Amino acid sequence: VEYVRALFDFNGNDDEDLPFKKGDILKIRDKPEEQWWNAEDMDGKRGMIPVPYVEKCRPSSASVSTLTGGNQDSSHPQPLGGPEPGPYAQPSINTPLPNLQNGPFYARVIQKRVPNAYDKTALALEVGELVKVTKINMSGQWEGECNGKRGHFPFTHVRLLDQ
Known part of the structure; x- marks a missing residue:
């Protein structure tokens, strides 16, 4: 409470x-x-x-452990050929994770897939959705959270909202 x-x-x-x-x-x-x-x-x-x-x-359900003993280790890159260290020609700085990130705010995912918190923890979303990235370690591959479904994913495919 x-x-x-x-x-x-x-x-x-x-x-x-x-x-x-x-x-x-x-x-x-x-x-x-x-x-x-x-x-x-x-x-x-x-x-x-x-x-x-x-x-x-606030207790209610069993097993309080929300993740106690997960995988702090980040997932390996899927793309082969090093596309680029940042986003495509972007006159702005919509780079992956600048620093700490303004959030946990509201990001509008505009490019993802269908992963399973098992595959690589990678949250499950869709283009036109939105996730609330909270976890942010490195300045590249970090973790986030939508409907509890936490995971990882580059910020190169989101459109931060106005909070």
Whole structure:
């Protein structure tokens, strides 16, 4: 309900963010939006936080483990011939993952397939859908989340919304 647990690590960095790492318990103070929530550290520090990076602290179903013991390792590339280190002639910077990514916001996937959280964890979506990328490690192949269906995929086929 109120306080939440961050088991996705955030390790932010700013005055308007609440960096954490280690099932930290952060109390909610103000939630202007639904995707983001203003939390407070256990020390007395207030900073924003990506909601998806926490569970919500609310039991109901069995097996709380949302992924405990997954595959932090990224999937190998399918394309052969190194098409390009970035997107096609894009006068903009719609490059894969710039840094941390503005999100977890709302991305409009315009080019994917039909994978199974088994194949390579690769979430399942369709051109004209949208996923909320939350997990972001490297600046290339990271992970995301739509309807729980987490996985990986290049940002070279999405159109970030207006949040």
